[PDB]
């Protein structure tokens, strides 16, 4: 009289999880754009745009969004459902790998979801070695009586790393369209290690993610492919470089609040690049990433990474959530941070030279800032920038510079410079949670 009796129930539960992740309130929108419009390289096009209140840090405890919280905990609950049951199922010898991968998917997803909750609602690990409040670690199934208190950021990372590490030992390395695989999980785990300052472990995981994905036939998009590769429909025979893709379909659409519709002047004209980022990017006019900018006349430049597949509306563009390019940048960062310049130059040069083969960082003693300056060009509109500055104890500095190629783009915010002491880099705990859970403590500066 329960929901998991046979393996296919696990597959059904995973399908539900991926369908939840596809929402524009989850990984087809809000969970992606958060780290861009709270940074320095993208902004809301106006205060009344969907991204406006995030860009302006305009939320209060009384009006803050609840979707990040609800969607991620929904996902975690179904992962728990799988994880509490999957090992009890008796299966055939020849279903073992398949079952191991299903369990690995659930573990990777739980780690991802708890990582997102922790970075959204808790101060960065390296501020105080995870001493601040993260969120509740929920590993079983909720009932009406469940009223957990927030664990620490450190405790959360313990769980995040444990789930992801274990997933890397269970997940298949095969191409798996719209699903998490070994190389995607290793790449995320490398990111999680960087945020924690575990650079040796970050480096090992990024390097192995690359070696494994490339043996499997994934490859960085060439300079020639880059401008249009985003609209390809990858397959096992042509994987491209996306290691985990959110698949959106004409017949299964996330709607007009998706990245595809927000990042387009044919959509909601919602979020664009800042002038300072345009000026940084165009310092090298042969940088191939200039070719994924879509200009609304001479007013705004949108990041045209959410390219619909053939026949589709921009609404149903897939989300390139984890890319091989990030494993390269993670390895570069971890190399710098462990004092291996040779290795940093090796990995960084692959990104640099794909953007423009006439450039090289050979002969440079690479700095963290050098690596992050490449990373911001590569990962613009994919949800990284604010976190990457803030996690490193750096100050986000919005620059009010003008450019005549994008002459309507200008900052419009009270908040131009901020670091990990700014209380609004964290969303407040949603009111519905505060109202329903008396063991829930609000983030500082809000109450
Ligand atoms: Ca699509």
UniProtKB/TrEMBL annotation:
Q: Which Gene3D superfamilies match?
A: 1.25.40.390, 1.25.40.900, 2.20.20.130
Keywords (alphabetical) are:
Calcium, Cell outer membrane, Membrane, Metal-binding, Signal
List positions binding Ca(2+). Answer: 248, 312, 316, 318
Report whether Acetylation shows up as a keyword of the record: no
Q: Which GO terms describe its cellular component?
A: cell outer membrane
The places in or outside the cell where this protein is found are: Cell outer membrane
Residues of the RagB/SusD domain: 301-446
The SusD-like N-terminal domain extends over 1-194
A GO term for molecular function: metal ion binding
InterPro entries per UniProt: SusD-like_N, SusD_RagB_dom, TPR-like_helical_dom_sf
Pfam families named among the record's database cross-references:
SusD-like_3, SusD_RagB
Do you know which PROSITE patterns this protein is assigned to?
PROKAR_LIPOPROTEIN
Specify the domain of life of the species encoding this protein. Bacteria
* Family label: Belongs to the SusD family.
The name this protein carries in UniProt is: Putative outer membrane protein, probably involved in nutrient binding
């Amino acid at each position: 009289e329960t929901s998991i009796n046979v393996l296919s129930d696990i597959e059904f539960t995973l399908n539900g999880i991926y369908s939840t992740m596809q929402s524009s309130d989850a990984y087809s929108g809000r969970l992606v754009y958060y780290g861009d419009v709270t940074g320095d390289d993208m902004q809301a096009v106006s205060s009344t745009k969907r991204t406006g209140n995030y860009y302006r840090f305009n939320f209060t405890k009384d009006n803050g969004p609840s979707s990040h919280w609800s969607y991620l905990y929904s996902i975690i609950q179904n992962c728990n459902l799988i994880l509490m049951n999957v090992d009890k199922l008796s299966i055939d010898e020849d279903e073992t790998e398949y079952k191991n991968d299903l369990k690995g998917q659930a573990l990777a997803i739980r780690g991802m979801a708890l990582f997102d909750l922790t970075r959204i609602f808790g101060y960065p690990y390296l501020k105080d070695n995870g001493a601040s409040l993260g969120v509740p670690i929920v590993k079983e199934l909720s009932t009406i009586d469940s009223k957990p208190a927030r664990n620490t950021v450190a405790e959360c990372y313990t769980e995040i790393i444990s789930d992801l590490k274990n997933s890397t030992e269970l997940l298949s390395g095969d191409f798996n369209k719209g699903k998490v695989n070994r190389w995607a999980a290793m790449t995320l785990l490398s990111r999680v290690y960087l945020y924690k300052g575990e650079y040796n472990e970050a480096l090992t995981m990024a390097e192995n993610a690359i070696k494994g994905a490339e043996k499997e036939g994934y490859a960085l998009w060439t300079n020639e492919e880059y401008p249009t590769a985003w609209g390809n429909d990858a397959s096992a025979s042509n994987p491209g470089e996306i290691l985990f893709e959110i698949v959106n379909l004409t017949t299964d659409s996330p709607g007009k609040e998706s990245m595809g519709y927000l990042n387009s002047y044919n959509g909601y004209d919602d979020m664009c690049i800042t002038c300072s980022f345009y000026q940084l990017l165009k310092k090298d006019p042969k940088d191939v990433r200039l070719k994924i900018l879509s200009f609304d006349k001479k007013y705004y430049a949108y990041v045209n990474k959410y390219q619909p597949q053939q026949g589709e509306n921009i609404t149903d563009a897939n989300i390139p959530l984890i890319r091989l390019s990030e494993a390269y940048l993670n390895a570069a960062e971890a190399a710098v941070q462990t004092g291996d310049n040779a290795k940093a130059v090796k990995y960084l040069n692959s990104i640099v030279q794909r953007a423009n083969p006439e450039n090289s960082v050979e002969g440079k003693t690479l700095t963290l800032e050098n690596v992050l300056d490449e990373r911001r060009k590569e990962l613009v509109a994919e949800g990284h920038r604010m976190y990457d500055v803030i996690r490193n104890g750096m100050t986000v500095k919005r620059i009010d510079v003008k450019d005549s190629d994008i002459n309507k783009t200008k900052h419009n915010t009270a908040y131009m410079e901020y670091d990990w002491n700014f209380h609004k880099i964290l969303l407040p705990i949603p009111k519905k949670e505060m109202d329903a859970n008396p063991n829930m403590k609000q983030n500082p500066g809000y109450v």
